[PDB]
Amino acid sequence: QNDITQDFLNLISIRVERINGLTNLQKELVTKYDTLPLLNMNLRLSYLRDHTYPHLQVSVQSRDRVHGIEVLVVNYKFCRNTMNPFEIQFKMFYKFEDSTLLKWEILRISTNVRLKAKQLLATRNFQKCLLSLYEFDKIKSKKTGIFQNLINLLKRKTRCYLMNNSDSLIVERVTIKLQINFIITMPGECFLPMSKISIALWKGGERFNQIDLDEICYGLIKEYGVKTGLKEICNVCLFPDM
Template sequence: MDFTSDSRAGSQSVPPQEDVPGSSSSSGGGSQLSPEHERVLRLQDVKASLLAKRNALVKEIETLQSKELPIEYRRTALLDLAELVPASDGETRTSVGFQDGYTAVQEELKYKHDCLPLLNMDLRLSYLQETYPYASLVLVDSSNLHVEFTRRADDHFRLILQLPQGPAVLSNNVRWPLRKLENCSNPTTILQGCYEFDRLRCRRDEVFQQVWSSLQSKGVFYRISGSLLSLWRNDLLLQLRFEIEIEGLFPRTHLNARLFKNEIPLSSPDNMALYKVY
């Protein structure tokens, strides 16, 4: 048998196969998004987030509004006056007419062509009452005004004022410190001075109470006599004198402090003017 042909055939090399286009698998595994498409998706996410925040804020606002109490406007003399101003009806009126404190506000406003104060006494009294809330004002007649100053609960004082130029009569408990006001011929100055004096008296009480309260835990004793506060412990004594005086027809405060040991002064009077501090 001839085996040469088979051996020769087996020794021949087989030519390599050529790569077929499209036969290899893609390494990407999927299609890629364009930059523009990715930007659109990001903007949609931002939009959804902002809408969610907006809805949450709207709910919070609605909740707060449901809890708000209705606003109540305080009646004032100016508001009452504004409601009395008559609407223009085109009617021509004369600018001449007799008016005084007893003229009704509606009637007075019909002929009002200037910026001067209204004459109606009730309206002017309501303005005064708003200006001086801690005073009770009673207009007895067109020339007599009675005022009671009530800021200090246990020590009221009264003022009887003759209009338009005084004189003024004060209660006995304040007549001496306010004696300069009794001789004043300006009712506004008298009323303002008395009101400020009453305010400063209450402020003095508050200051004395604050000083005493701050030292109470340190074993300090105290005594208040009018404008004088005395503080002592052992052989030391501190005196604070808070005076209210009328200077230039308006109240001013003066504070004087002195320190004693065994009733012997350790310091000269220390005067400090406390203008408008209290």
């Protein structure tokens, strides 16, 4: 009666996620226990574009495939100088498994660096060409920045006119002239572009000793700096007080 009712009552009463390339950062950081790069592709692209290669506009234009290769036409716009940037357009040929490069060629160069990057772009090593173009843009931007700063801090007392393209700035006072060379030499026959700073004084009559001015420039740039090293050279070539 009661025990059968209790037995009848006892009888009748009887995470893992998969992350991807496009995913939010919170769900990525919840399931983070390995020491691997983050798979959020937009954040990785933000690190690859905003932080390591700023002022550069890379955009993939087209990509095809034959039978087992992959062609890829991409263009770069080195926009560090906002007035007139120099562009380029590549075309690469993969091998897509045991992946090598077969061919790479240039479809166009914007005609501002075409001869300056003529000896460079015949080494057939496209990584060195890309890095040399980016560093040449950076060094050219630093050159025009330093020369505009030296003009802005000297435009009142002197006359400040440039020369050949921008490679040598000339100041003159009272007379006495001073020319500050700054040459960027692309590589050809290291692989990054290198700079060369040299000066030459004129005391009205003739040139000075190039060895002594070279030693003065070397010491006064090795000691002070570059942006604040040339200002000391203009202060010495003034010599009204010290």
